[PDB]
Each structure stands twice: as structure tokens, then as C-alpha cells.
């Protein structure tokens, strides 16, 4: 069924693509400097560096600053992925994607300054509560459905969906962060990347893959949210991989028959049977019985009352994040890896 609603979506996406392409072809560079920011506290870490809460001295606004050590990025062969991340993030604009406000680099590091999202990682809230009710999980899943509709329309694959990468804002809505493995590609791509529990079978089997991997991952996410544990787990990655390729899933006894039916279609090992990848595209998911009560337009416009609103005691509050050890930011007197990060 094509109707007026589907035509309005098509028109919105056409205009969004025009906007994206102007920024894609002419990316912003060097729009701030380190000493414009007061560093307050570390909010999170990774392999390339860390994320810190900072205050912009001229406006008094708080932001989350991601810092990447250029030498570590080279050592781990993530040069191209880091260039993809920044070029994509500065070009996108959607209600459920974190906004990149500034970017710059110095002799040692790359910096990306984003909006501060104070509600914490969905990961934290999920492990604490155990599991979300079906209506709670559906509210979040709808936001990711609309996000992947937007991203895929721009020829982007996201490739790292998991509760650790979803933050909850003050209104209880989701913001997707970490675009470290996002790529703009027409056609197939081949890199082995993502998180073991969330990897599609075609990635593991080295087959060449496309946007359908993101729809698999959404199946994994919905299961984990509704069960409290992922569908494929073990203590060692190789044991996880074995389970993923077998095509055997067990559902908890409390899953509704409609949830089970959606998940059998998202967790389809065979590419040409997987929801999101058939002729009706994303509409096979949006029209599924599990989503019959969902008002897609109201979700987009943020008019649905969220089931959970995190506690926030004033600007600058970090109580929804864990504590981490504070390291000094070292900036060398000589420039490192200048050629490699020329376009950043």
C-alpha cells in the first residue's frame, strides 16, 4: 500500500538528501581550539582515547568531547574509519542522532565536540532493571527504525548498533552515538567490524554485505531489550560466532507471538528472506503487527510521552555515568601523522 503518508516520507527524504550532500562535498574543518574548553570529568573510554565532559568558556554550554590519539589510530589501522566517522557525522541531521558541534586537531590528537546527552547509556539502565516491557522496548525500537530509514536512504551503513551506543536524553528519547564504523558505499563492503553478539552471519562468513546487516542487528537489539540477555551469548567470541551461523534461536516464554514473528523475520540467516531487505523495504517492518499501535509521525515529532525519564539534577550533572580514572591530555611539540589526517 502506497498512500499519502508514504509520499510525505519520500518528499522529506529527498530534501534531507540534498542537505546532506552539500555538507558531504564541503566538510567543516577546524571550527574550534582546545583552549576554548575547560575539561571537567571523563565520561567514557575506548581504544583510541576518551570522552570528557567539557565547558565552552565563551558560551558556558557543556559538551562531550571525544579525543583520539593519532598514533594509536594508525597502530590499529583505523585511519580510514576515523575519516569516515567525522565526514559523515558533520553532514547528518536527524532527531535521534547526536549533533557534532565542533571538530579540530593538534600535533597529537583529533577532537570531536558533541552535544552532551545527560541521561546515560541505555546499557546501564537495561542491566539495572533487567529487561524492558514490550511497550517500552517498542518505543525505543521505533526510533531506531526511523533512524535506519534515514541513514540507509543516504547510502550509509551504521554497523555498530548495541545498547552501549544509545544514550537517553532529558525527554527519555534515544540518541545514537559512535559512528566509528559508519561508511557511505553503494554496493557491497567487506570489513570485519562490529560487536560479536550483534554481527550478522554474512559478516562472519566473509561474504560481502550491505545495509541488511543493520536490520539483523535491530533484531538482536529488540531481543536483548525484551529478554534482558542477547539471543547468542557465550564466554568466548568464537563460541558466539558458531551460534549465530547455525540459525537456531530460542525465545523466552513471555515473548508475545507477534514479537516472536517479527524477530524470526529480522533474525533470518538468508539475506533474501530478511525483513528490511525485501521489495517493500522498511515498510515490511513498519507495517508488522507488533508495531500496529505505533504512530510513526508522532515518534519523529517527539510527541509521545516516554516510559522512562532519567533523573537530572542541573546542567553539568554526570550521575548517570560511571566514574573513570583521570589522565592528563598530552600535546607533543612535534606534529604526528600530519599527512594521514590532512582532511580531518
Amino acid at each position: 500500500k502506497k498512500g499519502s503518508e508514504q509520499e510525505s516520507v519520500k518528499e522529506f527524504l529527498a530534501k534531507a538528501k540534498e542537505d546532506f550532500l552539500k555538507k558531504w562535498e564541503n566538510p567543516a574543518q577546524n571550527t574550534a581550539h582546545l583552549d576554548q574548553f575547560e575539561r571537567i570529568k571523563t565520561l567514557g573510554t575506548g581504544s583510541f582515547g576518551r570522552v570528557m565532559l567539557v565547558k565552552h568558556m565563551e558560551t558556558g554550554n557543556h559538551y562531550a568531547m571525544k579525543i583520539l590519539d593519532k598514533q594509536k589510530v594508525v597502530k590499529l589501522k583505523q585511519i580510514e574509519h576515523t575519516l569516515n566517522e567525522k565526514r559523515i557525522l558533520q553532514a547528518v541531521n536527524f532527531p535521534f542522532l547526536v549533533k557534532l558541534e565542533f571538530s579540530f586537531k593538534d600535533n597529537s590528537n583529533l577532537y570531536m565536540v558533541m552535544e552532551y546527552v545527560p541521561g546515560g547509556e541505555m546499557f546501564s539502565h537495561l542491566r539495572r532493571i533487567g529487561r524492558f516491557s514490550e511497550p517500552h522496548a517498542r518505543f525505543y525500537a521505533a526510533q531506531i527504525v526511523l533512524t535506519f530509514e534515514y541513514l540507509h536512504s543516504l547510502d550509509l551503513i551504521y554497523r555498530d548498533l548495541k545498547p552501549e551506543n544509545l544514550l537517553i536524553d532529558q525527554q527519555g528519547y534515544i540518541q545514537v552515538t559512535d559512528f566509528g564504523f559508519a561508511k557511505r558505499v553503494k554496493g557491497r563492503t567487506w570489513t570485519l567490524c562490529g560487536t560479536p553478539e550483534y554481527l550478522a552471519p554474512e559478516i562472519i562468513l566473509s561474504k560481502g554485505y550491505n545495509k541488511a546487516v543493520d536490520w539483523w542487528a535491530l533484531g538482536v537489539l529488540i531481543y536483548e531489550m525484551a529478554a534482558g540477555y542477547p539471543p547468542f551469548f557465550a564466554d568466548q567470541p568464537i563460541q558466539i560466532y558458531e551460534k549465530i551461523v547455525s540459525g537456531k534461536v530460542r525465545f523466552p516464554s513471555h515473548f508475545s507471538s507477534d514479537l516472536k514473528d517479527l524477530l524470526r523475520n529480522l533474525l533470518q540467516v538468508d539475506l533474501t528472506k530478511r525483513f528490511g531487505n525485501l521489495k517493500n523495504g522498511v515498510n515490511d517492518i513498519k507495517n508488522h503487527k507488533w508495531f500496529a499501535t505505533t504512530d510513526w509521525i508522532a515518534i519523529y515529532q517527539r510527541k509521545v510521552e516516554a516510559p522512562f525519564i532519567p533523573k537530572f539534577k542541573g546542567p553539568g550533572d554526570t550521575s548517570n555515568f560511571d566514574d573513570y580514572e583521570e589522565e592528563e591530555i598530552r600535546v607533543s611539540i612535534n606534529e604526528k601523522c600530519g599527512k594521514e589526517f590532512s582532511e580531518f
Binding site: R127, K162, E164, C193, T195, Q236, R250
Partner: peptide
């Protein structure tokens, strides 16, 4: 139960990405 098996497993914390 499966949930009890999960919470006693070695992967209940934040999961890092892998890469080539």
C-alpha cells in the same frame, strides 16, 4: 534459567568492538 546463566557469564559488562 537462561537469565541466571547470562548474569554469571564473562560478558555482562560493556562490550568492545572487534576489527581486522
Amino acid at each position: 534459567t537462561t537469565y541466571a546463566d547470562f548474569i554469571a557469564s564473562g560478558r555482562t559488562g560493556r562490550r568492545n568492538a572487534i576489527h581486522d
